[PDB]
Design a protein around this ligand. Sequence first.
Ligand code: LBV
Ligand code: LBV
Lengths: 487, 483
Amino acid sequence: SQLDKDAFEVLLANCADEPIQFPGAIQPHGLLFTLKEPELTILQVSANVQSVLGKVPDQLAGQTLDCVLGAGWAEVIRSTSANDSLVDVPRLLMSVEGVEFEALLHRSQEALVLELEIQDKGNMGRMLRQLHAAADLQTLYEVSVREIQRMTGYDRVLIYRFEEEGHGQVIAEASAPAMELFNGLFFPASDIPEQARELYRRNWLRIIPDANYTPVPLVPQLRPDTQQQLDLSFSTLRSVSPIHCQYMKNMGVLSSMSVSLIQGGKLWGLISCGHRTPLYVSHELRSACQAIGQVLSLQISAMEALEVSRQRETKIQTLQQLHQMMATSDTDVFDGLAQQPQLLMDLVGATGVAIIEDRQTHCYGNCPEPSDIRALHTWMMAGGEPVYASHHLSSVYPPGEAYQTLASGVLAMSLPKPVDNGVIWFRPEVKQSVQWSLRLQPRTSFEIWKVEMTGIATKWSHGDVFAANDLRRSALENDLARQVSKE
Amino acid sequence: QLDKDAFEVLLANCADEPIQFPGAIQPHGLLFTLKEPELTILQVSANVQSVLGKVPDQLAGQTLDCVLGAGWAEVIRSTSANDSLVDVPRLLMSVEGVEFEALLHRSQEALVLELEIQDKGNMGRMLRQLHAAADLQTLYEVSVREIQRMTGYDRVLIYRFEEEGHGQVIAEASAPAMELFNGLFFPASDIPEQARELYRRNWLRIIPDANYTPVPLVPQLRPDTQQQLDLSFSTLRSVSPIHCQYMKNMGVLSSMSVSLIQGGKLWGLISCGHRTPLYVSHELRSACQAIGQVLSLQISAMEALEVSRQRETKIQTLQQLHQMMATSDTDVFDGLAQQPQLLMDLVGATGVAIIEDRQTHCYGNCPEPSDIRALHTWMMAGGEPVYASHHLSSVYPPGEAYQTLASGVLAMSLPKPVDNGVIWFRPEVKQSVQWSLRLQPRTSFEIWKVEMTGIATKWSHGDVFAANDLRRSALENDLARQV
Ligand SMILES: *C/C=C1/C(=C/c2[nH]c(/C=C3[NH+]=C(/C=C4/NC(=O)C(C=C)=C4C)C(C)=C\3CCC(=O)O)c(CCC(=O)O)c2C)NC(=O)[C@H]1C
Ligand SMILES: *C/C=C1/C(=C/c2[nH]c(/C=C3[NH+]=C(/C=C4/NC(=O)C(C=C)=C4C)C(C)=C\3CCC(=O)O)c(CCC(=O)O)c2C)NC(=O)[C@H]1C
């Protein structure tokens, strides 16, 4: 397939803007019918109508819904399709021509999308009990992944967390014995395109029962009512892009089932379940996984909130100690800050605390050569404000590349005293605290992350900047009186 | 006559009743306590003859095989070996015909086994429903409606514990032809502290019949330790007759309470009352426990967001007010005096009181400028730049003159010998609540009214933050305009 490889390589270059929401084909484990809400006439049909029902698709475009689905169920789907929210709808199991079909309903731009999924072949209280029993966030991730693996029966279960600029991190992983391990792996934001992220934000479950699937087209590809393509954003039977199918092939997973974790409308992460054999997931399993996803999304938000509030709680305690730390014979407040560096390091969070004063420089922790530090302090005038924050110093100050491991994100405060002053913080690179062991591959994904996240340190959160601007006022209140009170 | 007097004497010790050590259990099951190494019947319940029809006198210390049979004894011996009695599946058995569900726990180095009687998919839908809720009141209404539908209880109420442990019926769904309780604040004395500790320890409390005769635990003292068995973690525990009388006077004969615990603190309760006795199966109890846990997680989620959401809008109006004073230099708070609502909404208030000498400037609630002088004259004894009041009727002896107008007063006054001051008010909680013999919801409301006489809602930690965040702003901005 030399021609196909060239055609595929075209998709690889143009993958950040492919029309995922408008594939024009569905996965072949069911049927899709687009209908009209008032009369329920078959507006669009799938190519499997002859495969599972044995009806020629040419005579379906427009004609009666009774023709293929039977008049018996037509009234049922009319009644369940009456003017309603359709948000909460009970299960609707059917059987036409001896084929078991589960009917799911939604609406897309004044159309009734009917998804006839094919059918082949108590513990909840326990799962929520264990989820509540978790103490810390890492324990919560571990127990959640273990429980999802146990109940689903999926070979691999992974929790991706989207940290910064869309980059991902595999936090918790449980896998079947003797199979590839992914933990501490960081993948770039380019791996998941933005359209896929929007769909994951608008859908709880994404099921790909078989990567070796041939897409079946929707005939006709154009809806006569609007003369466009179907928006399959909310359809469970939506074709997967060949790029992700190749990615799953290279991984070794043939069936996937992703559960989205949404906090405050933002995609916190994903729960990805992979199988080495094509696995078909029943409705009960889907509902249980959705329930665990929502419960964990609620719980994760709570655990960080307690931890975020805890950091604020131990912040003001840290400043209070520091606000009185210079109570004894301080030549400068900074020289009083030189007694115990770890209080400064723990105030804002950084491996390097350096305060330059008295024609010399005082640094504790991960710091560069002192001569170049004043050159970084020579850049203080460029800020124009005591506060300074950066998650990437190389991009904003070009000669700050010699020290990327020691100083990638620098927090600073400088009192307006013109002679010699300023406080400097040093946070190391993210690349120096990450450990893990073809184009579309997890190993290749890690290398792109190490080049995309170059010289980038973890962003100083609003609390750290608040704890930074706080000492700006505290040092200004005290330092001037210290010299004045001597006189 | 004699029995009625014994009831009143019991009402004296309702505050410090030994609930954890009743010495009897509800008659809808059996209780045994056993030694872990041997599994011998250390202490038994009096209702053995009721179901098993066996003498109890030769059971204190004997082997379990004579009561529960050899096979079931071995099964529970294997179950109790090292399972830690946490996350243990259902263990239904049947001795002498009667089916018993065997729940297990351990108390002070003893193995308590409860044989509860056996009389007579939607969870995902309810979790989706609770996630779909947008506001807090919508969340409470949805939770109560779904809980009532799933459990089939005539009354389902959610109590929120506010201020000094007082109660508030936040949401309520009830069957027709039943008294309505909404906004019915009740005192903290209605639920004693021991009951609150037990509700914190146990998710579920089930009283299937208020008209029950307790079965005593014989012998009443464990020979191993010579004390009363602690039933603080057992579903089969006798309830105090005070609560039984309260439930009879309410008009409920069966109760099913799920405790909402946020961060180890009893946020509230989900009380399910029935007009007739009712028994809840294990599946129903597990489902209600799961919904309670989900709602406890979700209440904290929306509470935390609104705590932060109020902080973002606190700074938003904070910048606007501290940049306004640049327009007017006649008074340091003249710009503060142009938008009174931007001052009331800054911290939560129904009246702004900013006044210097020879001036009277208060918008909204204000008793009298002459009393405002006396209101401004309180600070001689308690003098700080930021002063707050949770109950002004106590700290200020003439706090009862204006309680509906100013019950909790938050005050900032910059340090200047010349007259100054910024003060905001807050009215009574008792003047914003409305609702329609000794142990009765009607009586409970009038006790709360007396117990809250001039008590305003506590100034939040973010509320005193906006008081100190306006301490620095008015301090620095004053000199530049004067200069
Ligand atoms: C520009 C196009 C590309 C692309 C497309 C693409 N990816 C997904 C889904 C993915 N891909 C993931 C990639 C990974 N990177 C890693 O390091 C690891 C290892 C653990 C993985 C799996 C990934 C995590 C997802 C999300 C899956 C989930 O759990 O939901 C899609 C969406 C497909 C769809 O139809 O929904 C697309 C279009 N992948 C590329 O690699 C680049 C070239
Ligand atoms: C000092 C003794 C008293 C007391 C004891 C008592 N009460 C409970 C449980 C209660 N009582 C509640 C009271 C209410 N107040 C109201 O306004 C309303 C109506 C809306 C009610 C129902 C109340 C809410 C509870 C908790 C219910 C639950 O089961 O969770 C107990 C606990 C009993 C036990 O064994 O668990 C005790 C000991 N009640 C009094 O009135 C005072 C005199």
